[PDB]
Amino acid sequence: IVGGTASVRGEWPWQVTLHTTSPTQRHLCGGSIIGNQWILTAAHCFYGVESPKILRVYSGILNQAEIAEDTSFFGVQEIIIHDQYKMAESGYDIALLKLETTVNYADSQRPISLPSKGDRNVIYTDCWVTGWGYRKLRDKIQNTLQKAKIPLVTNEECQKRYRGHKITHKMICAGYREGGKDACKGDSGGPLSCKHNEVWHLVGITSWGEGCAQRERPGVYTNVVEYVDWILEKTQAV
Ligand SMILES: O=C(N[C@@H](Cc1ccccc1)C(=O)NCc1cc(=O)[nH]c2ccc(Cl)cc12)c1ccc2[nH]c(=O)cc(O)c2c1
Ligand SMILES: [Cl-]
């Protein structure tokens, strides 16, 4: 996260840190708890991941220092990537992780509500992006979960800012005209969370951008409301 601040413990209790054990253990991506056995994240996080067996999900984490070899984690039973996903910049950057055990909800870890299809008209004015990513384009993974308030931009505006890309209605953008605050490397798969009427929704998934925090380069997020049928369909049994 560029231009953000340290979070309070438990203010983002849907936020997970997804780790890989290969070759040694490190943070890979963000993700959101959406159900007792379900993390929602970005499809591009699994480039070159051959097996779900090298994945570990940590919940209720503020600082990465909390993760040691004795720290408990959720194993991943199944990675489900959207079958139309080819790569982040051309959309469909959405994946589900089916955990091996279920999350026991608490003030430290519980789920975020998916957007309603009826919410497509709501103008959100209280949106935050969170993560352990870089504080600038060349940098490293941060210890403490950062947060940044960032206004959504319209798809017409965002399209103007990426004339070499096709910014579709299944993408949503957010950023300042002058830059300054943004997601950056390490943040992807994490939530773009918008509070409306005292209720938080999972409006987007951190996907990509050109650079981090540049002027006239909004962050691009998976537009979650566009995938509520896909999520329902994929999270059923057998
Ligand atoms: O590059 C990373 N993530 C990329 C995506 C990715 C994920 C997994 C493997 C390869 C690449 C990212 O966050 N991508 C999102 C992203 C990148 C960027 O440069 N600018 C942005 C501007 C706006 C928005 Cl919304 C997103 C971005 C990434 C992930 C985990 C890491 N762990 C480490 O221990 C050390 C790292 O250096 C590291 C880097
Ligand atoms: Cl472009």
Lookup: tokens for 140: 């490293």
Using alpha carbons, list the distances in angstroms from residue 32 to 109, 111, 136, 139, 238: 10, 7, 23, 24, 23
Angstrom CA distances, 220 to 36, 55, 118, 233, stand at: 27, 25, 22, 25
Q: Please state the residue numbers annotated as binding site.
A: 160-163
Q: If DSSP codes are grouped into helix, strand and coil, which group holds residue 238?
A: coil
Residue 47 one-letter amino acid: Y
How far, in Å, is the centroid of ligand 1 from the Cα of 109?
24
Output the residue whose Cα is nearest ligand 1's atom 11. Answer: 45
Q: Determination method here?
A: X-ray
Write out the two tokens for 181.
Answer: 């605050």
Place of tokens 């253990």: 25
Where helices occur in 120-193 by DSSP H, the ranges are 155-161
Residues 6+ positions from 2 with CB-CB distance below 8 Å: 134, 135, 136, 148, 180, 181, 182, 183, 184, 212, 213
Resolution of the determined structure in angstroms stands at 2.3
Instruction: Give residue 141 CA to ligand 1 midpoint distance, Å.
Output: 9
Where are the chain's structural domains? 1-12+112-226, 13-111+227-238
AA letter at 114? L
Q: Is the CB of 133 under 6 A from ligand 1?
A: yes
- Cβ–ligand 1 distance for 220 under 6 Å, the answer yes
Fold of 13-111+227-238: Thrombin, subunit H (2.40.10)
Residue 29 in contact with residue 130, Cβ under 8 Å? Answer: no
Q: What's the CA gap between 205 and 189, in Å, rounded?
A: 6
Report the DSSP pairing between strands 95-99 and 127-131: unpaired
Start-end of H helices in the chain? 155-161, 228-234
Give phi and psi for 54, each to the nearest 5. -90, 5
C-beta 89 within 6 A of ligand 1: no
Tokens describing residue 32: 């959101």
